[PDB]
């Protein structure tokens, strides 16, 4: 149950490499924007779910790269692809670390 600081991007109504592309296509079209508004939201990573809540069983994959900022990607379930934006890469990678044991928590 740790809390974080992020920026929001948007949502859609085999490996992680494919997930990055689907954002880059939906970004070059205009479905989801590149640079977000400065509005800072809390992304709490609890045992219950991603605290607007997301499951821990239905979640599949988390990706973080460098679009000196970063990006984020989820996979809840017809599939969903929730996209965010982190302050840096290290903190974006640090969120994965929480999911590494929160998965082993259930």
């Amino acid at each position: 149950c740790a809390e974080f600081r992020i920026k929001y991007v948007g949502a859609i109504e085999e490996g992680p490499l494919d997930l990055i592309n689907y954002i880059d296509v939906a970004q070059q079209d205009g479905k989801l924007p590149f640079v977000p508004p400065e509005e800072e939201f809390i992304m709490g990573v609890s045992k219950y779910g991603i605290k607007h809540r997301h499951a821990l069983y239905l979640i599949i994959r988390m990706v973080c790269y460098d679009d000196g900022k970063s990006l984020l990607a989820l996979k809840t379930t017809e599939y969903s692809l929730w996209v965010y934006q982190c302050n840096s890469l290290e903190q974006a990678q640090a969120i994965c670390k929480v999911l590494s044991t929160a998965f082993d928590s259930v």
């Binding site: 490996g15 979640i59 599949i60 994959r61 973080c64």
Partner: peptide
């Protein structure tokens, strides 16, 4: 060292 990290659901 790393550049892009991920975690898969078992």
């Amino acid at each position: 060292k790393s550049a892009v990290t991920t975690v898969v659901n078992p």
